[PDB]
Amino acid sequence: TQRYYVERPIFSHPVLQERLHTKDKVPDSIADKLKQAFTCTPKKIRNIIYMFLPITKWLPAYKFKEYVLGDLVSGISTGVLQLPQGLAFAMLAAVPPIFGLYSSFYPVIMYCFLGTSRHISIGPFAVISLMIGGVAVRLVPDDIVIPGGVNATNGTEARDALRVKVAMSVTLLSGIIQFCLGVCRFGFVAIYLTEPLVRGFTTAAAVHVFTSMLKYLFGVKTKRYSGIFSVVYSTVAVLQNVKNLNVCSLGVGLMVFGLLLGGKEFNERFKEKLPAPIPLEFFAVVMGTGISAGFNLKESYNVDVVGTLPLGLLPPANPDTSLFHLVYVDAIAIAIVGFSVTISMAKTLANKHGYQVDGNQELIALGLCNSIGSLFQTFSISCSLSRSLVQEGTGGKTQLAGCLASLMILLVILATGFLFESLPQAVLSAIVIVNLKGMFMQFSDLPFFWRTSKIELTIWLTTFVSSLFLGLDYGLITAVIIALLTVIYRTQSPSYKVLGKLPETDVYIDIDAYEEVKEIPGIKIFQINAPIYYANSDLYSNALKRKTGVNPAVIMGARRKAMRKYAKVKYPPIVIKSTFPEEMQRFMPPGDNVHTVILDFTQVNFIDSVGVKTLAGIVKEYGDVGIYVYLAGCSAQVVNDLTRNRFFENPALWELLFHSIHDAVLGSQLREALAEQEAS
Amino acid sequence: TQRYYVERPIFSHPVLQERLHTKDKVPDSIADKLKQAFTCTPKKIRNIIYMFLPITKWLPAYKFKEYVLGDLVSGISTGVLQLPQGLAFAMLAAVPPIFGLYSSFYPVIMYCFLGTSRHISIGPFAVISLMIGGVAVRLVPDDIVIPGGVNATNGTEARDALRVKVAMSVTLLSGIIQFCLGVCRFGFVAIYLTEPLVRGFTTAAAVHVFTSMLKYLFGVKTKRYSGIFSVVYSTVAVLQNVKNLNVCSLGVGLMVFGLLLGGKEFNERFKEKLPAPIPLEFFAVVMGTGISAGFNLKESYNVDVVGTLPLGLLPPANPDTSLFHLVYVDAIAIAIVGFSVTISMAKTLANKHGYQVDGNQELIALGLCNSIGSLFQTFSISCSLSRSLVQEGTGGKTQLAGCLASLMILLVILATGFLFESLPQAVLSAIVIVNLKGMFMQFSDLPFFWRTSKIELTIWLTTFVSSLFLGLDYGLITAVIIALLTVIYRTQSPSYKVLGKLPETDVYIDIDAYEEVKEIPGIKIFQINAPIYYANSDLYSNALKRKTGVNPAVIMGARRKAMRKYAKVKYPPIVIKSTFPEEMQRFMPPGDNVHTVILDFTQVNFIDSVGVKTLAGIVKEYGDVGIYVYLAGCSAQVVNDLTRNRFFENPALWELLFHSIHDAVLGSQLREALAEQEAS
């Protein structure tokens, strides 16, 4: 075996520096650093094509045997879920449901080629649909009359068309913003999305969706409220209007919701006995439309339905740029929220399955998809948590599952679009509610975060509160700001400890930690696990003057009191000898007689000018009362910062630095012994 | 002498822990921690009185011999400067100049008793006056007619009275806000005011004052613009209207400005030959009023003057609460700006003269002064940089200098208020401009900050730009946000280094730093001077995989390529043996054959859950390719955070920790030797 054995002289800063010679670096010119970027070698362009076109990468390496079955099952499962979710989200966007199915085909097909993640399900999203509906209602109210040859029997078709045009314009603007961010390499900001913030935001979004879905489930008309305090106003409005509910719609909604819960529980408890989960949502919608067609609930009980669905695709239409100045803020908010959600989902899925994704590529893909969808009459969409979870849980391995979902959506549109026109909205509302259980189950993190880290619990609660009461446009920004400020809070509240020397060794630990460390008499050691920046110097000084119990101010006051009671270019030395008479020292109150104070810098990352001034003031103040101060474990960054500042203007301060706490202690003891040598 | 000598066994985490026993702490109950707060001992109440009433402290200990002369000279010098500055600031507040002198008596007297700092000059301030004037104009335009018996010859007295009432109401609200903040111990936020931010804010405020003073100097009427892009609009407006200037006013202003510059330069170069500086501003105003009275410039050349000054004090008047809902934002902004400026000045003066101030006490004093001044017809004021500099430079030692200034201001008001009514505004504008040279000279910090620290230079430039173009209400907030974000920027860009062992010692330094350190073969050491929080884990992982040149992904790819080319409750062990045949190893590309990677945690302050997951993933990934990873120098905080998380669920991970880099290296070498013992 071997033992920790090392013998060396005391390494002060000048001694360490004189034994080392600075290495000569190789200057890399900017022109020379950019010249090789234009080699245009075939490998470089091939890599660029693969990065910009991920389809060319994962498609040639597609292993059919272990992927065809899983991709097929996952695609069927995600399509039979995207169709009702898309129809429900279309209603939430204040647009005809036919446009929701349109948004479920073009962006998915485009992302099957421009997408990097192979486990996320691109499609209609609840939050984006709610924001689009709110802005459409705000721009287009219910009191607009167009004399375009329409008679008095107005079916509000013009209002719906105007809302669709507004949605198309804002979608195009959001896509342009996303593409500009992607080409600007702005995707690096996704790292700021910590997991608790994302979970809290998703939970708050789930709460908003649940409280917005109440009106559809009950069937009672309620004004849509967008902005600050939207959730509370919406829920009190639906509570006040609950007296005029529809019995049939509520009953069928409760019945289908109970059936969905029973089927989901049965699938969960019979997972091993099935080769693939059965589509429960498809059975639910089939049952709902069959009952509605058989009993004619549209007029028999005045139960609202999804409405008519026109068939056939539409030719591309050029949008208009006359609405940018009205919804430019909302387009940016939609782009930010959608990009954040999709990048968070892609990152967590990549971590789960062991791969990587590129944020810039995702931004470019989202921008192109949104722009082309706007050209093809499709509103802005983003990633969906529940649908992606279903896709991954059913065996999703590549992006071909989304292509199958888009193909089957197109088939339904072209062939069986009329069959689903009689589906009541209550069934869709119940389907949305039951699929929301995954995000609602995330409330279990509160005890977990309470036990693990209270700071993360505070961040999660702040994010949830900000995204619940305040609008989602500013709630995410507020949550990000709070998360960033938590780092400042942590740096402003470090753990100050008094270190003691373990006997017969060189390990320094807290004096009040293990009962075996003995503090060296006459030496005080102070340690701070935080930087010395401007908003921390005062707290550090107070902690040093309090925890160590050595305050120069009170020492000077005691000296003055004892003196008054007993009476009845060159630089000066840093440490001034205590000119206190021995006779006066007889009336001096007893103390620890500390002669050396050691400050730990092993856990200091950087120091600013304010910190430099504070440290210089502390050193001078302690040297005035004749107490030596040495710096131990200073990193090269701290030394460089001190050199660039005016802290090292006096060459006599170079001897105050050391390399380790034990080295500083040995140097101080040697200095004391040498001083005692000439004493007598 | 002595040498660094220590012999000990390799201290792994279990070995260190088994040799130490946790100390039993003393639980301090909250009820027991608050019970002693109500002792009501005479010393405690005396200290409370001294803290709340600083006048009772420094007045009994007033040394007359060395303070009477200096305080007298400083008080005279600051009064003869506050009178013209107060008159000028009153005009900038869109209020009659008599109110400016009123603001120069009551708050100063009150602060002479409720103030802690003994070197700051409380009085009218340019920024606060400008904000008050802007809000008064915004609330009270020039198109308001009051049929209160006034004939067609309206002198706009009602408009001035309404503006005064608005100023009084906003001053009272700001004082209430300041008092509430003071009683809430909110003064601790003053630590966020770093020196570069304060200097940039003061410089931008000086620029705003200089560009606003142009209209008074020229005498041409110009609409006052408040809000965003106010400075640019004001300067282009005065440039367009410069064609209608007044020759006499501009000429006399230039003459008095030149005289002031000459006198200031003469005093600077004859400082040693004078016992006390002569009052130059008093001579300037006397000359200006004498010339104006002799030549009657009011009507001879249409030169505007300060106006009539009513005599006698006014009885207290109860304000109204009907304007809070209109200026509540502006009152908060005024309070924040004034408190920030005064606390910064008090802190820097305390540091210069070697004492301390309390932010909460300053907040309480400002709130009480503003509220009582509102009761006594006085607008909100704050500390002035130039006047405080003059007070300190003339020998200011206590607060009695301000009392003398208030007394002489009251004497002028009661006796010689009519004499100064003929003083032209050009003289006051020139006096303001010449006293602004101190803040304008602060532009020399740009090369200093460029050489010392580029980050502080960026902060200063950002603060200046934000407070120049954008409004001062939001410019300070933006500067604070940028300053806070600079810490995050520093933590997101650390300095990754590869460490090497100095021969015959235990000092590890950068391999490319001193040319003498030799890297130990087969061992990679990585060091990061930054935390491992959520917004830094990915960069840390990339740096570890790039700088060390040991990426498990490329290793696995090379192994697979070599294999394909040559072919033609218990837990698993963390490190998996490389099942690579020796025959296949013959086709394996050569490499450094690293068997151990050491991660430095001596400079790590904290790690979050995201960092814990990232570290666990890195450890597992490196153990998959059969590479050992050890953690060295982990602080108690990091160990506690890992324990609270799920990182230590497997007991086999406790042996991976160490106490020092050398200890980890010795342990790895011993493990390799032991493994080689059973090899053959």
Side-chain angles (χ1 to χ4, degrees), chain A residues 63-84:
Chain A
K63 275 70 181 179
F64 309 95
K65 267 63 182 179
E66 54 270 31
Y67 293 162
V68 163
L69 180 60
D71 293 359
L72 175 66
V73 175
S74 183
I76 295 299
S77 62
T78 190
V80 301
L81 179 60
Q82 187 177 1
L83 188 147

PDB file of all heavy atoms in Angstrom, chain A residues 63-84:
ATOM      1  N   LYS A  63     -33.891   0.433 -39.184  1.00  0.00           N
ATOM      2  CA  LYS A  63     -33.934  -1.018 -39.014  1.00  0.00           C
ATOM      3  C   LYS A  63     -35.396  -1.450 -39.027  1.00  0.00           C
ATOM      4  O   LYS A  63     -36.122  -1.254 -38.051  1.00  0.00           O
ATOM      5  CB  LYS A  63     -33.236  -1.437 -37.724  1.00  0.00           C
ATOM      6  CG  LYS A  63     -31.725  -1.610 -37.844  1.00  0.00           C
ATOM      7  CD  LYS A  63     -31.009  -0.282 -38.033  1.00  0.00           C
ATOM      8  CE  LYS A  63     -29.510  -0.479 -38.184  1.00  0.00           C
ATOM      9  NZ  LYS A  63     -28.799   0.811 -38.396  1.00  0.00           N
ATOM     10  N   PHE A  64     -35.823  -2.049 -40.140  1.00  0.00           N
ATOM     11  CA  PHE A  64     -37.240  -2.343 -40.333  1.00  0.00           C
ATOM     12  C   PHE A  64     -37.754  -3.355 -39.315  1.00  0.00           C
ATOM     13  O   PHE A  64     -38.868  -3.212 -38.798  1.00  0.00           O
ATOM     14  CB  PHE A  64     -37.475  -2.851 -41.756  1.00  0.00           C
ATOM     15  CG  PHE A  64     -36.887  -1.969 -42.820  1.00  0.00           C
ATOM     16  CD1 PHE A  64     -35.627  -2.228 -43.336  1.00  0.00           C
ATOM     17  CD2 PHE A  64     -37.595  -0.883 -43.308  1.00  0.00           C
ATOM     18  CE1 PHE A  64     -35.083  -1.419 -44.316  1.00  0.00           C
ATOM     19  CE2 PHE A  64     -37.056  -0.071 -44.288  1.00  0.00           C
ATOM     20  CZ  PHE A  64     -35.799  -0.339 -44.792  1.00  0.00           C
ATOM     21  N   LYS A  65     -36.952  -4.378 -39.007  1.00  0.00           N
ATOM     22  CA  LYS A  65     -37.453  -5.518 -38.243  1.00  0.00           C
ATOM     23  C   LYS A  65     -37.947  -5.107 -36.859  1.00  0.00           C
ATOM     24  O   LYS A  65     -39.009  -5.557 -36.414  1.00  0.00           O
ATOM     25  CB  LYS A  65     -36.368  -6.590 -38.125  1.00  0.00           C
ATOM     26  CG  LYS A  65     -36.415  -7.656 -39.212  1.00  0.00           C
ATOM     27  CD  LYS A  65     -36.188  -7.068 -40.597  1.00  0.00           C
ATOM     28  CE  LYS A  65     -36.287  -8.138 -41.672  1.00  0.00           C
ATOM     29  NZ  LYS A  65     -36.094  -7.573 -43.036  1.00  0.00           N
ATOM     30  N   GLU A  66     -37.197  -4.256 -36.162  1.00  0.00           N
ATOM     31  CA  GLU A  66     -37.550  -3.858 -34.806  1.00  0.00           C
ATOM     32  C   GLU A  66     -38.234  -2.498 -34.735  1.00  0.00           C
ATOM     33  O   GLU A  66     -38.508  -2.017 -33.631  1.00  0.00           O
ATOM     34  CB  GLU A  66     -36.307  -3.859 -33.911  1.00  0.00           C
ATOM     35  CG  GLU A  66     -35.145  -3.023 -34.425  1.00  0.00           C
ATOM     36  CD  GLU A  66     -34.200  -3.814 -35.309  1.00  0.00           C
ATOM     37  OE1 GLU A  66     -34.665  -4.742 -36.003  1.00  0.00           O
ATOM     38  OE2 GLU A  66     -32.988  -3.513 -35.302  1.00  0.00           O
ATOM     39  N   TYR A  67     -38.523  -1.869 -35.873  1.00  0.00           N
ATOM     40  CA  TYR A  67     -39.154  -0.556 -35.879  1.00  0.00           C
ATOM     41  C   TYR A  67     -40.511  -0.516 -36.564  1.00  0.00           C
ATOM     42  O   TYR A  67     -41.343   0.310 -36.186  1.00  0.00           O
ATOM     43  CB  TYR A  67     -38.244   0.482 -36.558  1.00  0.00           C
ATOM     44  CG  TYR A  67     -36.963   0.792 -35.815  1.00  0.00           C
ATOM     45  CD1 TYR A  67     -35.893   1.397 -36.462  1.00  0.00           C
ATOM     46  CD2 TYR A  67     -36.824   0.493 -34.467  1.00  0.00           C
ATOM     47  CE1 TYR A  67     -34.721   1.686 -35.792  1.00  0.00           C
ATOM     48  CE2 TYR A  67     -35.657   0.778 -33.786  1.00  0.00           C
ATOM     49  CZ  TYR A  67     -34.608   1.375 -34.453  1.00  0.00           C
ATOM     50  OH  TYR A  67     -33.443   1.661 -33.780  1.00  0.00           O
ATOM     51  N   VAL A  68     -40.760  -1.377 -37.556  1.00  0.00           N
ATOM     52  CA  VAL A  68     -41.983  -1.267 -38.351  1.00  0.00           C
ATOM     53  C   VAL A  68     -43.216  -1.478 -37.480  1.00  0.00           C
ATOM     54  O   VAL A  68     -44.182  -0.706 -37.544  1.00  0.00           O
ATOM     55  CB  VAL A  68     -41.948  -2.255 -39.531  1.00  0.00           C
ATOM     56  CG1 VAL A  68     -43.344  -2.460 -40.097  1.00  0.00           C
ATOM     57  CG2 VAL A  68     -41.011  -1.748 -40.616  1.00  0.00           C
ATOM     58  N   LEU A  69     -43.203  -2.522 -36.649  1.00  0.00           N
ATOM     59  CA  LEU A  69     -44.362  -2.805 -35.808  1.00  0.00           C
ATOM     60  C   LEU A  69     -44.571  -1.715 -34.764  1.00  0.00           C
ATOM     61  O   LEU A  69     -45.692  -1.218 -34.588  1.00  0.00           O
ATOM     62  CB  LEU A  69     -44.201  -4.169 -35.136  1.00  0.00           C
ATOM     63  CG  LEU A  69     -45.340  -4.611 -34.217  1.00  0.00           C
ATOM     64  CD1 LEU A  69     -46.647  -4.706 -34.988  1.00  0.00           C
ATOM     65  CD2 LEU A  69     -45.010  -5.937 -33.550  1.00  0.00           C
ATOM     66  N   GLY A  70     -43.502  -1.326 -34.066  1.00  0.00           N
ATOM     67  CA  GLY A  70     -43.633  -0.308 -33.037  1.00  0.00           C
ATOM     68  C   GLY A  70     -44.068   1.034 -33.591  1.00  0.00           C
ATOM     69  O   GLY A  70     -44.928   1.706 -33.015  1.00  0.00           O
ATOM     70  N   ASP A  71     -43.482   1.444 -34.721  1.00  0.00           N
ATOM     71  CA  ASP A  71     -43.873   2.707 -35.338  1.00  0.00           C
ATOM     72  C   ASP A  71     -45.325   2.673 -35.797  1.00  0.00           C
ATOM     73  O   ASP A  71     -46.050   3.661 -35.648  1.00  0.00           O
ATOM     74  CB  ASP A  71     -42.946   3.032 -36.510  1.00  0.00           C
ATOM     75  CG  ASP A  71     -41.527   3.326 -36.065  1.00  0.00           C
ATOM     76  OD1 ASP A  71     -41.267   3.296 -34.844  1.00  0.00           O
ATOM     77  OD2 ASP A  71     -40.672   3.586 -36.937  1.00  0.00           O
ATOM     78  N   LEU A  72     -45.765   1.545 -36.358  1.00  0.00           N
ATOM     79  CA  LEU A  72     -47.152   1.427 -36.800  1.00  0.00           C
ATOM     80  C   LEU A  72     -48.118   1.550 -35.627  1.00  0.00           C
ATOM     81  O   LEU A  72     -49.095   2.308 -35.687  1.00  0.00           O
ATOM     82  CB  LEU A  72     -47.355   0.096 -37.527  1.00  0.00           C
ATOM     83  CG  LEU A  72     -48.780  -0.254 -37.955  1.00  0.00           C
ATOM     84  CD1 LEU A  72     -49.281   0.713 -39.015  1.00  0.00           C
ATOM     85  CD2 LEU A  72     -48.854  -1.689 -38.455  1.00  0.00           C
ATOM     86  N   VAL A  73     -47.854   0.812 -34.545  1.00  0.00           N
ATOM     87  CA  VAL A  73     -48.734   0.861 -33.380  1.00  0.00           C
ATOM     88  C   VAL A  73     -48.739   2.258 -32.774  1.00  0.00           C
ATOM     89  O   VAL A  73     -49.797   2.801 -32.431  1.00  0.00           O
ATOM     90  CB  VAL A  73     -48.318  -0.204 -32.348  1.00  0.00           C
ATOM     91  CG1 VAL A  73     -49.151  -0.073 -31.083  1.00  0.00           C
ATOM     92  CG2 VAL A  73     -48.461  -1.597 -32.940  1.00  0.00           C
ATOM     93  N   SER A  74     -47.555   2.865 -32.640  1.00  0.00           N
ATOM     94  CA  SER A  74     -47.467   4.203 -32.067  1.00  0.00           C
ATOM     95  C   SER A  74     -48.191   5.226 -32.934  1.00  0.00           C
ATOM     96  O   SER A  74     -48.869   6.119 -32.415  1.00  0.00           O
ATOM     97  CB  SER A  74     -46.002   4.595 -31.879  1.00  0.00           C
ATOM     98  OG  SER A  74     -45.890   5.861 -31.256  1.00  0.00           O
ATOM     99  N   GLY A  75     -48.054   5.114 -34.258  1.00  0.00           N
ATOM    100  CA  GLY A  75     -48.729   6.047 -35.143  1.00  0.00           C
ATOM    101  C   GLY A  75     -50.239   5.936 -35.072  1.00  0.00           C
ATOM    102  O   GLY A  75     -50.944   6.948 -35.044  1.00  0.00           O
ATOM    103  N   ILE A  76     -50.757   4.706 -35.042  1.00  0.00           N
ATOM    104  CA  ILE A  76     -52.200   4.520 -34.906  1.00  0.00           C
ATOM    105  C   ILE A  76     -52.682   5.090 -33.577  1.00  0.00           C
ATOM    106  O   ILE A  76     -53.689   5.808 -33.512  1.00  0.00           O
ATOM    107  CB  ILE A  76     -52.567   3.032 -35.049  1.00  0.00           C
ATOM    108  CG1 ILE A  76     -52.254   2.539 -36.464  1.00  0.00           C
ATOM    109  CG2 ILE A  76     -54.033   2.807 -34.715  1.00  0.00           C
ATOM    110  CD1 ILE A  76     -53.017   3.268 -37.546  1.00  0.00           C
ATOM    111  N   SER A  77     -51.953   4.793 -32.496  1.00  0.00           N
ATOM    112  CA  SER A  77     -52.355   5.255 -31.173  1.00  0.00           C
ATOM    113  C   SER A  77     -52.323   6.774 -31.065  1.00  0.00           C
ATOM    114  O   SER A  77     -53.209   7.366 -30.438  1.00  0.00           O
ATOM    115  CB  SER A  77     -51.461   4.629 -30.104  1.00  0.00           C
ATOM    116  OG  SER A  77     -50.109   5.016 -30.281  1.00  0.00           O
ATOM    117  N   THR A  78     -51.316   7.422 -31.650  1.00  0.00           N
ATOM    118  CA  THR A  78     -51.242   8.875 -31.584  1.00  0.00           C
ATOM    119  C   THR A  78     -52.221   9.554 -32.533  1.00  0.00           C
ATOM    120  O   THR A  78     -52.677  10.663 -32.239  1.00  0.00           O
ATOM    121  CB  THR A  78     -49.814   9.362 -31.866  1.00  0.00           C
ATOM    122  OG1 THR A  78     -49.719  10.760 -31.566  1.00  0.00           O
ATOM    123  CG2 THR A  78     -49.428   9.141 -33.319  1.00  0.00           C
ATOM    124  N   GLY A  79     -52.566   8.920 -33.656  1.00  0.00           N
ATOM    125  CA  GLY A  79     -53.562   9.504 -34.540  1.00  0.00           C
ATOM    126  C   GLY A  79     -54.961   9.464 -33.956  1.00  0.00           C
ATOM    127  O   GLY A  79     -55.699  10.456 -34.013  1.00  0.00           O
ATOM    128  N   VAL A  80     -55.347   8.319 -33.380  1.00  0.00           N
ATOM    129  CA  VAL A  80     -56.678   8.200 -32.796  1.00  0.00           C
ATOM    130  C   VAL A  80     -56.835   9.087 -31.569  1.00  0.00           C
ATOM    131  O   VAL A  80     -57.959   9.299 -31.103  1.00  0.00           O
ATOM    132  CB  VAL A  80     -56.999   6.735 -32.445  1.00  0.00           C
ATOM    133  CG1 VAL A  80     -56.914   5.859 -33.686  1.00  0.00           C
ATOM    134  CG2 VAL A  80     -56.071   6.229 -31.353  1.00  0.00           C
ATOM    135  N   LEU A  81     -55.733   9.597 -31.023  1.00  0.00           N
ATOM    136  CA  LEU A  81     -55.778  10.582 -29.950  1.00  0.00           C
ATOM    137  C   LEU A  81     -55.669  12.013 -30.455  1.00  0.00           C
ATOM    138  O   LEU A  81     -56.281  12.913 -29.871  1.00  0.00           O
ATOM    139  CB  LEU A  81     -54.654  10.318 -28.942  1.00  0.00           C
ATOM    140  CG  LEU A  81     -54.552  11.282 -27.759  1.00  0.00           C
ATOM    141  CD1 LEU A  81     -55.830  11.254 -26.939  1.00  0.00           C
ATOM    142  CD2 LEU A  81     -53.346  10.952 -26.896  1.00  0.00           C
ATOM    143  N   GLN A  82     -54.913  12.239 -31.531  1.00  0.00           N
ATOM    144  CA  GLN A  82     -54.755  13.585 -32.067  1.00  0.00           C
ATOM    145  C   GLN A  82     -56.035  14.083 -32.721  1.00  0.00           C
ATOM    146  O   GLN A  82     -56.322  15.285 -32.674  1.00  0.00           O
ATOM    147  CB  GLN A  82     -53.600  13.616 -33.067  1.00  0.00           C
ATOM    148  CG  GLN A  82     -53.243  15.003 -33.571  1.00  0.00           C
ATOM    149  CD  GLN A  82     -52.050  14.991 -34.505  1.00  0.00           C
ATOM    150  OE1 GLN A  82     -51.491  13.935 -34.802  1.00  0.00           O
ATOM    151  NE2 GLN A  82     -51.654  16.168 -34.975  1.00  0.00           N
ATOM    152  N   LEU A  83     -56.807  13.188 -33.340  1.00  0.00           N
ATOM    153  CA  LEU A  83     -58.051  13.623 -33.974  1.00  0.00           C
ATOM    154  C   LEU A  83     -59.027  14.245 -32.980  1.00  0.00           C
ATOM    155  O   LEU A  83     -59.472  15.383 -33.218  1.00  0.00           O
ATOM    156  CB  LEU A  83     -58.676  12.449 -34.741  1.00  0.00           C
ATOM    157  CG  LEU A  83     -59.893  12.716 -35.630  1.00  0.00           C
ATOM    158  CD1 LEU A  83     -59.872  11.788 -36.833  1.00  0.00           C
ATOM    159  CD2 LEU A  83     -61.195  12.544 -34.859  1.00  0.00           C
ATOM    160  N   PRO A  84     -59.386  13.600 -31.861  1.00  0.00           N
ATOM    161  CA  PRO A  84     -60.286  14.281 -30.916  1.00  0.00           C
ATOM    162  C   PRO A  84     -59.631  15.457 -30.218  1.00  0.00           C
ATOM    163  O   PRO A  84     -60.294  16.474 -29.978  1.00  0.00           O
ATOM    164  CB  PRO A  84     -60.667  13.168 -29.931  1.00  0.00           C
ATOM    165  CG  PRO A  84     -59.518  12.237 -29.969  1.00  0.00           C
ATOM    166  CD  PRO A  84     -59.041  12.244 -31.392  1.00  0.00           C
TER     167      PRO A  84
END
